[PDB]
Structure formats: C-alpha cells, structure tokens
Design a binder for this molecule. Structure first.
Ligand SMILES: COCCCNc1cc(NCc2cccnc2)c(C(N)=O)cc1[N+](=O)[O-]
Length: 294
C-alpha cells in the first residue's frame, strides 16, 4: 500500500484479498479490496466508477476506486461483522424475530434503492450483508458482478456458494432481472428463521434439484416458458411441492406469505422489493439492537 495502513486481513473475497485498513492522511478506517489479470478492462473501470454515486444508508458505501500501477483497489465503508458470522453466533437461540424482521426490512429498502437505479447485485449471500452495533444492516458489493462477472472458484480456489442462486440463473437464462436478488434474499430470510440453509446445493444440478424438491418441479402452468430455458431438460424428475408450513416452521402466516412471494419460480411473478416493503409482515417492524461482541 502507500496511503493505507493494513490493520488486519478480513479474508479472501470473490475477487481478491480484503483488508481492514486505516487511511494514514484522514485516519478513516475502511475495507480495502484488491481486485484480481493484465491491464484492467476499461469497461469495468467506467462501470465500477458509476457505483460511487449509488449511495444509500443500507448500501455499503464505495469510497474510492483506485486504478494506479495498473492495479485495481476498491475502498469501502467498514462494518465490524457480517451476517454469516452473526448467524453462526446466534445458532444457539436464533436471531429474535424482531431483529430478523428489521434486517429483512432494511435489506429490502437497499434493494428497492439499487433496483430503482437499475443496478443488480446478482450474488447476495450472508457473507456480504454487513451489520453494526446500531442495528443497521447493509448490502455489500452491489454491481460488482455486472462489472467483473461471478467466478466458479475464488482466487484461492474456494468454491463460490450456489445456495442463494435463483432458478432462472441455474437454468441458463442469460439476462438477469432484479428478481434474482429477491430470490437470494428470500433464501437468506428463510435461513435466519430456521437456522439452516434453505437450499444448500453442492453443484448446479444439486442446487436446482434441491429447489425442485421443496417448491415442486416447475412446469408451464406456474412458470410460462420454463421448458424452453437453455438448460431445462424434459428428463428432470417431477417432484410435488411441499407446504411452507413445513419449510420454515414456526414462522407465522405473514412471514410465510411474504417468503412464498419472494420464491415464486416465474421472475415476473416474484414480488418486487418495493411491493415487499408494503407486505403486512412489516406492520409491526421495529429496529432492535443486536447483541454484538466485537
Ligand atoms: C473476505 O470475505 C469474508 C466475508 C467478510 N467480508 C467482508 C466483511 C466486511 N465487514 C465485516 C467484517 C467481518 C469480519 C471481520 N471484519 C469485518 C467488509 C467491510 N466492508 O467492512 C468487507 C468484506 N469483504 O469485502 O469481503
């Protein structure tokens, strides 16, 4: 580095190493990501740069895009904990419903904001939802997938998780819609509630079949056009749909009704972030503070 003092290694991200660092001139504490081959594609630069203006309280702020020495670094606002770690830490008694509801509400506001500006995330997962001691939760890395794409493995060879991937993506659709993020968030919502991943697939077909086993194998009635998707095979086993009462017990009917709308197969029928914010589930939403030991 030069202007940033490295405090500690956060880990290996989907695009490269991430460090907690301190700006030597301002003293500001940030997350510094070194982006992975030769020359840095100008298109990515222009696209990522546009993200500097995508500002919202529930979106991790992109502070700077440094393109020097033909290297690429992204400087982000720093938060002390991610939802994956917080969930593992809450596995004992689970995250209280009021906090789950507050987090879901805030995440939907972030999605509504990005989606209104036509920006998609495409790879939402607990690891990129960040929280602070004030009860805020923020979405990290919106827009990077479009700028850099999503790898099978990270640079250290870790397998990028498929657990939150929408079915249209798994079936080969080339054009992603905002619906892909609602799906991922629905999966995360279900995981906060049950304390178990909803669809923990370990391959693309295992991921797809896990979805089919729970929500039923999609057909033309529920998803017009599904049998014409690039990777759809008429040989897919036909599983009957299970009851949500069995999928996320003991979530109440407001919660199950919202989840069901976030997991509709047809992207076009899937609830939008803005409409989800108006769902009765949020009638009694509050902003509790989590128990965070840093
Ligand atoms: C390398 O990824 C592993 C997943 C966590 N990854 C991240 C976690 C963050 N914060 C929460 C946190 C968690 C643990 C320690 N210290 C801070 C931040 C950030 N912007 O503050 C960035 C990334 N990331 O850009 O990846």
């Amino acid at each position: 580095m030069e202007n940033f003092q490295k405090v500690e290694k956060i880990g290996e991200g989907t695009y490269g190493v991430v460090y907690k660092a301190r700006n030597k001139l301002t003293g500001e504490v940030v997350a510094l990501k070194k982006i992975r081959t030769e020359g840095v594609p100008s298109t990515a630069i222009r696209e990522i740069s546009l993200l500097k203006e995508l500002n919202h309280p529930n979106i991790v702020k992109l502070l700077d895009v440094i393109h020097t020495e033909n290297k690429l670094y992204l400087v982000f606002e720093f938060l002390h904990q991610d939802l994956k770690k917080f969930m593992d830490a809450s596995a004992l008694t689970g995250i209280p419903l009021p906090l789950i509801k507050s987090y879901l509400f805030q995440l939907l506001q972030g999605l509504a904001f990005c989606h209104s500006h036509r920006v998609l995330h495409r790879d939402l997962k607990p690891q990129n939802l960040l929280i602070n001691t004030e009860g805020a939760i923020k979405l990290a890395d919106f827009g990077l997938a479009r700028a850099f794409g999503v790898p099978v493995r990270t640079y250290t060879h870790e397998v990028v998780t498929l657990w939150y991937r929408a079915p249209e993506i798994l079936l080969g659709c080339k054009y992603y819609s905002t619906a892909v993020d609602i799906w991922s968030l629905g999966c995360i919502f279900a995981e906060m509630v049950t304390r178990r991943a909803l669809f923990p697939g370990d391959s693309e077909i295992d991921q797809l079949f896990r979805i089919f086993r729970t929500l039923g194998t999609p057909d033309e009635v529920v998803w017009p056009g599904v049998t014409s998707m690039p990777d759809y095979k008429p040989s897919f086993p036909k599983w009957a749909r299970q009851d949500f009462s069995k999928v996320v017990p003991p979530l109440d009917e407001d919660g199950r009704s919202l989840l069901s709308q976030m997991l509709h197969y047809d992207p076009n029928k899937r609830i939008s972030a803005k409409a989800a914010l108006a769902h009765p589930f949020f009638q009694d939403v509050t902003k509790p503070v989590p128990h965070l030991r840093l």
